[PDB]
């Protein structure tokens, strides 16, 4: 997949993160958007575990 | 054929009524101007009053002529003679033509320019990739140089390369057509907002999109099941008759310009067996224009990666 | 409890028990991605009554109605916003109806309620009673109009000219839009609709006792709503008054003009003689080269920046009066050191709000070396460049295109006061599309 952006982005994210759940912390933090990282630019389907808790 | 001499060095044409005098002129020993601001169906009648015009001894100028998407009404043209090569020594000149989509320059017809180069500016919808063909076919292959035909505004908003839609399946009756096409995924699936389907009665194949708009327009929306490739019912068509059909994708030509791709079918001809609205340009666009960006913001904000 | 600094809730309903003690949230609330959809009606939070910032719900796939969660949620002050919106309710794939039936004021932002697959009871509730400026609301794409059959019981309910309708108003099939009669005028009211103290916002446990308010239409202090903070008490986080015992003991602060604040504003600075002294510049940072601006949320990040050492983009598709806020955040910007660009900003009539902008240094440029650029601004009738006020471009070209309502004489007058003729073609500042339809 070259790019992913909409509902299918939150679906593929829920699929990869599964039941571990998403990480979140207060912006306290960097101003770089996942969408620029994976919809405009060519996305990496192995990165999107990096958003999940561990 | 008949030669015409006209009293001005240049006959301006402002209207059908002023073209009317040239009706049945074939060889026009003068310059021409076209300055056609507004008016209905005009191109259909200008082919009658001028389409036989094939040899222009002067220059030819077109200006402000926002009425004209297509030059197809100058059917046959063969010669422009350069006897009045302009400043820069130009003999064909089109300027500020804020709707010009298509020259006559097409597989069916060649041209000759005897002398005097070509000029183009502020033609926002005439793709800069189209004219490269026209200047070669006209024989002026390398006479022009960079600034003589600017690249900046000409065709600046035009969809100058389109993906191809495939007709997947077709069906017909003695008065109906049903037709389908592959699920066009644009690169970012929100970018598509709808499909437009055009059809017209076209008993001979010598047809193009730009035939004046005589194209019946149909608006059809992608069914929300992403497993269904789209299709339409076309109904109440003439029996025992050929119809022509083609499809253009509707896409948000913003954010990325030419990386918003645009898509078009080839033309399809069908023999049958023996409404439009004004504002939907925006009033639909609005509801993806101002929803896609909010989604992109929400996704940028809500997710944050671990270290 | 006065919870904070802000609540982000995701993954599971079982984390939601963190709300069991909160009654005011000094921050946003997020409820996100609760994909299990299962626990549903195991949870309640009647303690909660005011949210000082926006509320975001996203894909909470299990939930029928928020009135099961937040029956009393009475004010959403909106002191921060989420893309102009103070409430967002998005892709609630099972949400039938809002509830929130006690909700009685939204004190700043608009609403965006969108895509909700099953949401009845949209706009059968007078948003002009609950908030000003209904024209900023954006209710779109939900369950389409004819499919619901929105009702109140017996419909026998509280009513109004719902816009140019005349109808019963209904939060949900069980509950009217509980409303305080016009006899109250500007006042709120208690149960039995008796009009309360003019510092109450929303309901009130007893009539016209200042202690009785639920929430305060100006400030809260020591259990009483008050129109302004007492002597020696500082306004904090836009709803409560505090003293040095708090503001000194917020984790890494300063005090100024009776605000308690994270830093001294423009024209004031730390004096180390004592850390309270914001003694009489302010620089915004960068990380993207392109600090795009699109909403009050992205503009609020500039609030009181004097020197913006980056490049702007402006993109304001919608928003009836947003310039009134953008002046408040951005009008203090005297310098942009990069380029500037404007795009598709169909809401702007004028740059007037860029109040004190002096300079555009063009340290960084567009392709084509444009240090300023203006495209497709279908309503920008006016530049802020009235000759009273200077604007100096210290390098590089201008560009202008497709500004249909902007008279060329105006952009030429700018060419005069910027003195900047010797840098552009016919195209870059053309008549042939800029102002072509200007009245
Ligand atoms: C196309 O073919 C038809 C023959 O059916 C002919 O009458 C017509 O002149 C041709 N050209 C155009 C432009 O239709
Ligand atoms: C709520 O407050 C009570 C009383 O102090 C305490 O026992 C309980 O643990 C608190 N729970 C949470 C989640 O804060
Ligand atoms: C909400 O409260 C604010 C307080 O400033 C007020 O301006 C606004 O008009 C109120 N709206 C309603 C509907 O009470
Ligand atoms: C245009 O911008 C680039 C980068 O700032 C600069 O190096 C160049 O000298 C400028 N002038 C041109 C390209 O004429």
DSSP-H helix ranges across C161-250: 244-247
| B112, B91 contact by CB (below 8 A) | no
Contact assessment for residue C169 and residue C161, using Cβ atoms and an 8 Å cutoff: no
d(CA C188, CA C209): 12
Radius of gyration of chain B measured on its C-alpha atoms: 23
Resolution (A): 3.7
The three-class DSSP label of residue B240 is coil
Written as six digits, the tokens of A24 are 């979140």
- What sign has the CA pseudo-torsion C16, C10, B287, B266? negative
Collapse the DSSP code of B28 into the 3-class scheme (helix H, G, I; strand E, B; otherwise coil) and give the result: strand
Element containing residue C90 per DSSP (H, E) = strand C85-90
Q: Closest Cα to residue C354, out of C316, C317, C404, C318?
A: C316
The sheet carrying B231-235 orders its strands as B167-172, B176-181, B231-235
Tokens at C268, concatenated: 């004031």
Residue C406, token pair as written in the block: 């902007």
Q: Are C77 and C108 in contact (CB under 8 A)?
A: yes
Phi, psi of B163 (to 5 degrees): -65, 160
Q: Of B74, B62, B3, whose CA–CA distance to B32 is shortest? A: B62
Distance CA C100, CA C71 (A): 5
Neighbour-count burial of C374, counting CB atoms closer than 10 A to its CB (0-12 exposed, 13-18 middle, 19+ buried): buried
DSSP string, C109-154: -EEEEE--TT---SSSS-HHHH-S-GGG-EEESSS-GGGS----TT
Closest-CA distance of chain A to residue C37, Å: 13
For the record, the structure tokens of C72 come out as 């009393």
Which residue has tokens 């103290």?
Answer: C197
Q: List beta partners, residue B169.
A: B180
Q: In this complex, which of A6, A34, A36 lies closest to B303 when CB atoms are compared? A: A34
Partner-chain contact B295 A6, CB within 8 Å: yes
CB A13 within 8 A of CB C270: no
Task: Find chain A residues with C-beta within 8 A of B299's C-beta.
Answer: 9-10, 33-35
> In DSSP terms, which residues pair with B231 in a beta bridge?
B180
Q: Which atom of ligand 1 is nearest to the CA of B203?
A: 5
Q: Tell me which chain B residue has its CA closest to the CA of residue A33.
A: B300
Cβ contacts of residue C245 below 8 Å, gap of 6+?
none
Q: In this structure, how many other beta carbons lie within 10 angstroms of the beta carbon of residue B15? A: 17
Q: By alpha-carbon position, which residue is closest to atom 6 of ligand 2?
A: C21
Would you call C293 exposed, middle or buried from its count of C-beta atoms within 10 A (0-12, 13-18, 19+)? Answer: buried
Task: Using alpha carbons, select from B101, B219, B229 the residue that is nearest to residue B165.
Answer: B229
The total of other beta-carbon atoms located within 10 Å of residue B269's CB is 14
- What backbone phi and psi angles, to 5 degrees, belong to C286? -135, 160
Does the distance separating the beta carbons of C6 and A22 come in below 8 Å?
no
Q: Which helix (H) or strand (E) holds C292?
A: strand C290-293
Own/partner pairs for B300-304, CB < 8 Å, 24+ apart? B300/A33, B300/A34, B300/A35, B300/A36, B301/C82, B302/A24, B302/C30, B302/C32, B302/C56, B302/C58, B303/A13, B303/A22, B303/A24, B303/A34, B303/A51, B304/A23, B304/A24, B304/A25, B304/A27, B304/A29, B304/A51
Contacts of A35 in chain B (CB under 8 A): 296, 299-300
Residue C298 has what DSSP assignment?
Answer: H
Six-digit token string for B95: 């300027």
- Alpha carbon of C70 to ligand 2 centroid (Å): 19
Q: Are B40 and B67 in contact (CB under 8 A)?
A: no
Provide the residue count of chain C. 439
Q: What is the sign, positive or negative, of the torsion defined by CA atoms of C426, C428, C433, C437?
A: negative
CA dist., res. B77 & res. B113, Å (int) = 10
Residue B248 phi, psi dihedral angles, 5° rounding: -125, 135
What is Dmax (Cα atoms) for chain C?
75
Q: Which CATH class is domain B167-271?
A: mainly beta
* Residue with the two structure tokens 């004028």: C350
β-bridge mates for residue C224, sequence order: C221
Instruction: Tokens for B140, please give them.
Output: 């002026």
Q: Domains in chain A, please, with CATH?
A: 1-54 (1.10.100.10)
Whether the CB-CB separation of C330 and C302 falls below 8 Å is answered with: yes
Q: Which positions in chain C touch B147 (Cβ < 8 Å)?
A: none
* C141:B302 CB<8 A: no
Taking only Cα atoms into account, the Rg of chain A, rounded to an integer number of angstroms, comes to: 11
Residues pairing with C397 in the sheet: C370
Method: cryo-EM
Whole-number Å distance between alpha carbons of C310 and C305: 12
Distance in angstroms (rounded) separating the CA atoms of residues B258 and C326: 32
Ligand 2, atom 7, residue with closest C-alpha: C21
CATH pick for C283-418 out of 3.20.190.10, 1.10.3720.10, 3.80.20.20, 3.40.50.300: 3.80.20.20
Of the candidates C398, C339, C328, C397, the one whose C-alpha atom is nearest the C-alpha of residue C363 is C339
Count of C-beta atoms within a 10 Å radius of residue C123: 17
DSSP string over B246-282: EEEEEE---SSGGGS--EEEPPEEEEPP----STHHH
Q: Which pair of structure tokens corresponds to residue C189?
A: 């009211």
Nearest CA to C99 out of C13, C41, C25, C20 is that of: C41
Q: Exposure string (b/e) for A3-36, b if CB count within 10 Å is 16 or more?
A: ebbeeebbebbbebbeeebbbbeeeeeeeebbbe
Sign, Cα dihedral of B31, B37, B38, B41:
positive
User: CATH 2.60.40.10: which residues of chain B?
Assistant: 167-271
Residue whose CA lies nearest to ligand 2 atom number 2: C21
Give which of B183, B225, B306, B307 to mutate to test A binding, by max A Cβ within 10 Å: B306
Q: Which residue has the tokens 């073209």?
A: B19
| CATH T-level assignment (fold) for domain B3-138 | 24 nucleotide stem-loop, u2 snrnp hairpin iv. U2 a'; Chain A (3.80.20)
Residue B15's nearest CA partner among B50, B55, B53 is B50
Return the H-helix or E-strand segment holding C373.
Answer: strand C372-375
List of chain C residues whose C-beta atoms are within 8 Å of the C-beta of residue A10? 59
**Residue C376 burial (CB < 10 Å; 0-12/13-18/19+)?**
middle
Q: In whole angstroms, what is the distance from residue C145 CA to residue A43 CA?
A: 38
Distance CA B206, CA B107 (A): 11
Q: What is the C-alpha to C-alpha distance for residues C220 and C243, in angstroms, rounded to an integer?
A: 13
Residue indicated by tokens 């400043």: B87
């Amino acid at each position: 997949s070259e790019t992913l952006c909409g509902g299918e982005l939150v679906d593929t994210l829920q699929f990869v993160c599964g039941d571990r759940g998403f990480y979140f912390s207060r912006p306290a933090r960097r101003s770089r958007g996942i969408v620029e990282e994976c919809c405009f630019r060519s996305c990496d389907l192995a990165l999107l575990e990096t958003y999940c808790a561990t | 054929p008949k030669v015409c001499e006209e009293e001005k060095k240049t006959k301006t044409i402002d209207s059908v009524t002023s073209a009317q005098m040239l009706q049945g002129c074939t060889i026009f020993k003068g310059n021409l101007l076209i300055n056609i601001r507004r008016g209905n169906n005009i191109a259909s009648e200008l082919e009658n009053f001028m389409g036989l015009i094939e040899v222009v001894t002067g220059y030819v100028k077109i200006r402000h002529s926002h009425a004209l998407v297509s030059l197809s009404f100058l059917k046959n043209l063969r010669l422009i003679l350069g006897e009045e090569q302009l400043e820069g020594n130009y003999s064909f000149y089109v300027l500020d033509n804020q709707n010009l989509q298509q020259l006559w320059d097409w597989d069916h017809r060649n041209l000759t320019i005897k002398a005097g180069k070509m000029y183009f500016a502020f033609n926002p919808k005439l793709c800069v990739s189209e004219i490269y063909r026209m200047e070669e076919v006209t024989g002026t292959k390398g006479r022009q140089s960079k600034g003589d035909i600017n690249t900046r505004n000409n065709g600046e908003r035009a969809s100058c390369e389109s993906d191809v839609l495939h007709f997947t399946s077709t069906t017909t009756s003695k008065n109906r057509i049903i037709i389908t096409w592959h699920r066009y995924r644009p690169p970012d699936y929100r970018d598509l907002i709808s499909f437009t389907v055009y059809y017209k009665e076209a008993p001979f194949k010598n047809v193009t999109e730009y035939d004046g708009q005589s194209w019946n327009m149909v608006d059809v929306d992608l069914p929300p099941n992403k497993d269904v490739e789209p299709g339409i019912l076309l109904h109440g068509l003439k029996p025992w008759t050929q119809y022509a059909v083609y499809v253009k994708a509707v896409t948000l030509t913003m954010v990325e310009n030419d990386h918003i791709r645009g898509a078009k079918s080839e033309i399809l001809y069908i023999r049958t067996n023996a409404p439009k609205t004004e504002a939907e340009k925006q009033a639909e666009k609005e509801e993806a224009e101002y929803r896609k960006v909010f989604e992109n913001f929400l996704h940028n904000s809500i997710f944050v990666p671990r270290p």
